Amino acid sequence: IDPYLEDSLCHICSSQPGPFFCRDQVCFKYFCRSCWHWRHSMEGLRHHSPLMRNQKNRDSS
Ligand SMILES: [Zn+2]
């Protein structure tokens, strides 16, 4: 079954669509700029990189 916005929202702030995701086993959840900085506030996880969830169209006509 496909996911929903009621389960793929931010899991810490639930105030944004969770536009990013963290691939490490200590995050493994969706985040926004706010809750991303809450799981990466310390220097120990600064090696993580956010995955995208949306992109621009290949046309602008
Ligand atoms: Zn992370």
Ligand SMILES: [Zn+2]
């Ligand atoms: Zn968030």
